Symmetry: C2
Subunit: 195 residues, 2 copies
Amino acid sequence: HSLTTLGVEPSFPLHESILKVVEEEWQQIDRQLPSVACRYPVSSIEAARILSVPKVDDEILGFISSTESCDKHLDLALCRSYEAAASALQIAAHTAFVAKSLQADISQAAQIINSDPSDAQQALRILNRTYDAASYLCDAAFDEVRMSACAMGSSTMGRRYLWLKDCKISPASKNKLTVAPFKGGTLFGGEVHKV
Amino acid sequence: HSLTTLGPLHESILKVVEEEWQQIDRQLPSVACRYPVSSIEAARILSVPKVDDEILGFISEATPAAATQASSTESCDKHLDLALCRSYEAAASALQIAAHTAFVAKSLQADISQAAQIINSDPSDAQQALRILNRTYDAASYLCDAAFDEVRMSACAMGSSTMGRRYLWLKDCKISPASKNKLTVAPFKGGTLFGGEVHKVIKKR
């Protein structure tokens, strides 16, 4: 009857908690990306290499060794976008595995319930596991949301530096415009009183 | 007990990522039909932010013009802006999918408990529980599908990020334009920005 878990026990409106998650990440778009290493462990050396931010080949660096400040900021933005997306992928990968196990468990319980509705205790034990898996999936979905919000914030931060790189305004005004909170809609939000 | 749904796990995930990476400079697939979202709020959030005319006008007026320089970064700049826009869009799409995933996950858990109560009370209602479980079975496959779509969107974002960085790092790289073109459009393989193609143009120490 009352199962239990250690976790959370033509229009599709956006959930209010999703909006809140996005808005809070966007209050400070230039921050470190949350690690997902402990909750969504990467399952292999291959995935591991493919998930890490790709390095600039030494071969290319050999042929290189005042927008340099811009160049570093743009690189950082792109690196964070990649990192936020890699994390979302790691989570999605975990979700796939869980969705699958949950599916196998449902069939199992169905098979028990069918073979004479009396082995309730067994089927109810299996359902208790599925219920937990469902809670986990809902939590994983909110983590995916958070990562997307971070990726969107980094993209935005990058475009802010890019669009201000050639105009002649004090570093103060440029910095103010670049770190300002983001609300979606427009790139700079709208510092009406720039001067 | 015959459950059904109308339409190498790790291997499958790798395949999708690799397929998207064969052409990193490409338009993103739409999620509007499969993962529709509504509200003035989500519309503002999901669309790539645009530069406002008052800020754009201000930037322009503060942008000096003359002959001299001649080295207009315009090209590179457009490539970088496109990469960051695509990164935003790929992420926003993954967000729409995630939103649906939260909804389905929560619905699935309410159904599981409903089935639990049925078989907990008078087990005789086997067919009743089976119909509830048949629905949870579908929701679970939906979730697996959504997870693969999220993986796809993430791979696209990573591809776009990598494209942006290839243009950024080749900018002041003292190599010919033909070599730069080749490295930039090469398939992305992970590990390094140009790995898999780099050696075909520059040997290592």
